Design a protein around this ligand. Structure first.
Ligand SMILES: [Br-]
Ligand SMILES: [Br-]
Ligand SMILES: [F-]
Ligand SMILES: [Mn+2]
Ligand SMILES: [Mn+2]
Lengths: 299, 46
């Protein structure tokens, strides 16, 4: 049928072709194909709110970090779009071997199913970070530096948080001492880079820590840790039930905090060959009952 | 008040790193991963 300038259906077909291949095989799109994905998804991102208000049913996913074949397993097990609705929490690139195929498939599904597929910004969707941790090198090796800058301009337009049915608050990192009204998130203008401190930084960088009472300093060198009492007060003040975030590897692929007031999701099993963790996604049905679908390494 | 957890509904697929990704398909390798004409039932963005 009608092709379209983006050649989108062909791109998705070639990305999904390697479902039947030995893991590790590259999918080498053209530069202009990738730029098209960046420019159209950028326009879609800016046309939707920076604080996404979503309905269940929905499957929520944590970090992928370029583990493209684990992304394909997640879709194969959870259902390929639009069979399921998806919200990813960021950290698509860096650390893994195939950040390119990973982000390209994600951007392509964003364009294909723009009301049923959602991507938040993680702290690695940031030039100062993915310059160092792998994505820049991958872009330079398989394409050129200009394409990396095109990705950066796209990433600068990613939305930052989501609220599911007024009850589950989702972001990549966590809470902020400056987050007092949801309007403060809505007022963040795009495109923006990630600052080294402040609200946008903490939403992408902060971590829960049961061993701190309120706010602690974060081992990552930026942002904060926050204790169980901070979570309880935040949920109470905003009439929320749950914080759903990612950003930290967890042995089971999901991990509860503060009497299940917070869950951490992480969707890259055997994280960059250094850990022996499972990857998981959280299925949220229309009653807001939450369960987990897990990819568990055996070998 | 509304969110609940049904952990008994958890499901786990085991895999080797060298396995074809299609091998986690619950219904096997004949399932169609992508139909370019399939529409979503309804949007979830408010
Ligand atoms: Br340049
Ligand atoms: Br805890
Ligand atoms: F879904
Ligand atoms: Mn992160
Ligand atoms: Mn990460």
């Amino acid at each position: 049928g009608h092709m379209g300038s983006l050649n989108l259906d062909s791109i998705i077909g070639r990305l999904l072709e390697v479902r039947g291949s030995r893991p590790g095989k590259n999918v080498q799109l053209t530069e202009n194909e990738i730029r098209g994905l960046c420019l159209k998804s950028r326009e879609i991102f800016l046309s939707q709110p920076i604080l996404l208000e979503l309905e269940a049913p929905l499957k929520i996913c944590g970090d992928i970090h370029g583990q493209y074949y684990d992304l394909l397993r997640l879709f194969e097990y959870g259902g390929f779009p639009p069979e399921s609705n998806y919200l990813f929490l960021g950290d698509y690139v860096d650390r893994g071997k195939q950040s390119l195929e990973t982000i390209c498939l994600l951007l392509a599904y964003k364009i294909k199913y723009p009301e049923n597929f959602f991507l938040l910004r993680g702290n690695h969707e940031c030039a100062s970070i993915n310059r160092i941790y792998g994505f820049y090198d991958e872009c330079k090796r398989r394409y050129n530096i200009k394409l990396w800058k095109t990705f950066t301009d796209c990433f600068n337009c990613l939305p930052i948080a989501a609220i599911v049915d007024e009850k589950i608050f989702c972001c990549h990192g966590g809470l902020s001492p400056d987050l007092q009204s949801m309007e403060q998130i809505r007022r963040i203008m795009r495109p923006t880079d990630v600052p080294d401190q402040g609200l946008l930084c903490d939403l992408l960088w902060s971590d829960p820590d049961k061993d701190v009472q309120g706010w602690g300093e974060n081992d990552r060198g930026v942002s904060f840790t926050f204790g169980a009492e901070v979570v309880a007060k935040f949920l109470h003040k905003h009439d929320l039930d749950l914080i759903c975030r990612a950003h930290q590897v967890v042995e089971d692929g999901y991990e509860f905090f503060a009497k299940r007031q917070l869950v951490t999701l992480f969707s890259a099993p055997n994280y960059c060959g250094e850990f022996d963790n499972a990857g998981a996604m959280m299925s949220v049905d229309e009653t807001l009952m939450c369960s987990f679908q897990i990819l568990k390494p055996a070998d | 008040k509304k969110v609940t957890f049904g952990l008994n509904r958890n499901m786990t697929a085991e895999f080797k790193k060298t396995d074809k990704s299609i091998l986690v398909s619950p219904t096997g390798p004949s399932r169609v991963a992508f139909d370019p004409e399939q529409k979503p039932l309804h949007g979830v963005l408010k």
